[PDB]
Design a protein around this ligand. Structure first.
Ligand code: DT7
Ligand code: DT7
Ligand code: ZN
Length: 259
């Protein structure tokens, strides 16, 4: 209900008490064991078509910040790869850490990255996002790791607006943002069936996790860490470590798009 989060007392280890699916058979994130993932020749080429993406607004929802898109038409879509049909971009957000050595949700051979970007798309055959999350193939989330190094120019516009949405419930106009600037060079990926990584933890996501991390600067991620979980006029709780740890793989195979 009201109060799941990422603190010591309402964090991932507590979510199962309100969302029993937390201990389910296809939970996310997972560790990606690179030596055990198998190249899959049946995967079709991945198609990220964001040229007509229409960003609208950026929102601090008390868990992360969301950059929201107009998904009232097929303006920005994800197709191909493991996906059947057309998945429409609705929003992106990140998960990040208090320190550069943690923050990602997925891990790679148990390595944690400083952060992880989630580009969230819903299967248009289900008509709207709320319907799609009730379906095993309702969403496709494109996950991209962030490591700390050189600045990501295409991220800076996001960074510079965070001061205006410091606290929970704050939003700002965020039009004309092009998410293609957040992508790495290669679209090589791993894929597996999983879930939302926050409550309600619905098992409705085809995860597509890019192999190549993007580099962002220390300065850029430091500004992520100045956001607040709390609302305005409440004691400051820095928005850090808003990641769920790796969950049991159970009866799933992670597939690779690349040899
Ligand atoms: C009112 O105090 C609390 C409320 C709740 C939790 C813990 C609390 O004490 C810290 C954890 N749940 S959960 N299972 O993570 O969704 C949500 C509600
Ligand atoms: C708006 O409803 C939600 C949307 C999303 C999430 C949770 C939601 O309800 C809490 C978390 N995921 S994620 N982390 O990529 O698995 C995707 C977007
Ligand atoms: Zn996420």
């Amino acid at each position: 209900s009201h109060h799941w989060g990422y603190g010591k007392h309402n964090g991932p280890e507590h979510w199962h008490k309100d969302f029993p699916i937390a201990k389910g058979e296809r939970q996310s994130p997972v560790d990606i064991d690179t030596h055990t993932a198998k190249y899959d020749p049946s995967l079709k080429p991945l198609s990220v078509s964001y040229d007509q993406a229409t960003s609208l607004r950026i929102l601090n929802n008390g868990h992360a910040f969301n950059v929201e898109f107009d998904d009232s038409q097929d303006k920005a879509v994800l197709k191909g790869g493991p996906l059947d049909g057309t998945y429409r971009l609705i929003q992106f957000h990140f998960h990040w850490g208090s320190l550069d050595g943690q923050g990602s949700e997925h891990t790679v051979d148990k390595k944690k990255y400083a952060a992880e970007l989630h580009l969230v798309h819903w299967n248009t055959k289900y008509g709207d996002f709320g319907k799609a999350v009730q379906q095993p193939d309702g969403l496709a989330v494109l996950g991209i790791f962030l490591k700390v190094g050189s600045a990501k120019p295409g991220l800076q516009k996001v960074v510079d607006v965070l001061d205006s949405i410091k606290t929970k419930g704050k939003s700002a106009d965020f039009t004309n943002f092009d998410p293609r600037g957040l992508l790495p060079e290669s679209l090589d990926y791993w894929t597996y069936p999983g879930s939302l990584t926050t409550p309600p933890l619905l098992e409705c996501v085809t995860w597509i996790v890019l192999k190549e991390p993007i580099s962002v600067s220390s300065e850029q991620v430091l500004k992520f860490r100045k956001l607040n979980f709390n609302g305005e006029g409440e004691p400051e709780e820095l928005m850090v470590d808003n990641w769920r740890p790796a969950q049991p793989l159970k009866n799933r195979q992670i597939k690779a798009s690349f040899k």
